[PDB]
């Protein structure tokens, strides 16, 4: 069930930093091209937190960053409501 | 039931703060390398606000944000949901 | 986990030739091979990269859309497909692997490939 | 395109002195910088990647340091004799720096 969410999550990211990072190269002065600093990128993102060092600049990448997007918020939020409850049920 | 997810965010904050801090000196040109600032950083960051004032660039430190963010966001997000009801319940 | 290149020698200035890169080694899904370049007493140029996994792979001005790089996943290589040499690409030609972290943990041998009439 | 500026050229210091070369990059580049021996002949072999951490079986003498200024430092031997080659990853696409050929005194 949860398990489900983070993994899925965790896929999503996996996805999402491999792609914009594929997606990235070949434009001079594109930041967001390798996997570990595409994957920092990927979560900054689906935490809706979005620092700003880091953002594809090519037209594939940003529909890369939109499908990590809904893909990643809804997969994390998943996995921050799985965290709450079981802080509530507990106490 | 409230209060425990207060502290437990004011925790998980003071905590990010620390490590980050701790992560982050040693490497050259870290910004996000004293407990003040580490804990603005670690605050504007659980919000899911996230402005680009300060982040991690060591690897530990990202991962030390990474823990901050699913705690906090969740943490935080405890205390959101508490002060909705709190205006819902009596209005 | 080694690289094996093969080809390359002497072209007519305007002609073609094709460079090969074998796997040879535990190669993951996604690795870039890429084609670096020396000539004669100069230092490095990065050329191309290349995913196998997408085919997709990325030149550099200097060789334009001069060059092209091909991947057979099937025979495990990378090659270089160089249309409209000059005497400028008198030089040698090594692939490498970098494992989406951005150096060059493995080399090819190196061959020459010479331009002249 | 991003600039790896390598100081200097050739260096004929003595064996067993203390040597360094300098990669100055035209804009910062993160910690995104490697260093490459390639010796006459052979294919490059990576030295140093992010900019500090040393690769299994590159011999102790090696370390490399820092702003936009990086740096690799030779505590120095006779196989050290090279060309020493600086390398660019943080914005694409990478580049490398002209090179230092060390040469060996005695």
């Known amino acids: 069930c949860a398990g489900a969410a983070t993994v899925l999550l965790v896929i999503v990211l996996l996805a999402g930093s491999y792609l914009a990072v594929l997606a990235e190269r070949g434009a001079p002065g594109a930041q967001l091209i390798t996997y570990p600093r595409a994957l920092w990128w990927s979560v900054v993102t689906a935490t809706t937190v979005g620092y700003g060092d880091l953002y594809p600049v090519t037209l594939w990448g940003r529909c890369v960053a939109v499908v990590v997007m809904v893909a990643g918020i809804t997969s994390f939020g998943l996995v921050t409501a799985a965290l709450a409850t079981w802080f509530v049920g507990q106490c | 039931c409230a209060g425990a997810a207060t502290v437990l965010l004011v925790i998980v904050l003071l905590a990010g703060s620390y490590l980050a801090v701790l992560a982050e000196r040693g490497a050259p040109g870290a910004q996000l390398i004293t407990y003040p600032r580490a804990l603005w950083w670690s605050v504007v960051t659980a919000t899911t606000v996230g402005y680009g004032d300060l982040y991690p660039v060591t690897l530990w430190g990202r991962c030390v944000a990474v823990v901050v963010m699913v705690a906090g966001i969740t943490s935080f997000g405890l205390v959101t949901a508490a002060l909705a009801t709190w205006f819902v319940g009596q209005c | 986990v080694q690289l094996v290149e093969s080809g390359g020698g002497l072209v007519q200035p305007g002609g073609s030739l094709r460079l090969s890169c074998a796997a040879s080694g535990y190669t993951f899904t996604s690795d870039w091979i890429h084609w670096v370049r020396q000539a004669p007493g100069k230092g490095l140029e990065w050329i191309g990269e290349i995913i196998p996994s997408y085919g997709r792979a990325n030149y550099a001005d200097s060789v334009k859309g001069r060059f092209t790089i091909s991947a057979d996943t099937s025979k495990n290589t990378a090659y270089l497909q160089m249309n409209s040499l000059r005497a400028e690409d008198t030089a040698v030609y090594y692939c490498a692997r970098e494992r989406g972290d951005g150096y060059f943990d493995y080399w090819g041998q190196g061959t020459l490939v010479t331009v002249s009439s | 395109d991003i600039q790896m500026t390598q100081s200097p050229s050739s260096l004929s210091a003595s064996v067993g002195d203390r040597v360094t070369i300098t990669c100055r990059a035209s804009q910062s580049i993160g910690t995104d910088i490697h260093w490459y021996q390639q010796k006459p002949g052979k294919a490059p072999k990576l030295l140093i990647k992010?900019?500090?951490e040393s690769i299994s079986g590159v011999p102790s003498r090696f370390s490399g340091s820092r702003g936009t200024d990086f740096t690799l430092t030779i505590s120095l031997q006779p196989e050290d004799f090279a060309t020493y080659y600086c390398?660019?990853?943080?914005?694409?696409?990478?580049?490398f720096g002209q090179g230092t050929k060390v040469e060996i005194k005695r």
């Open positions: 992010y900019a500090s």
């Open positions: 390398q660019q990853s943080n914005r694409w696409p990478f580049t």
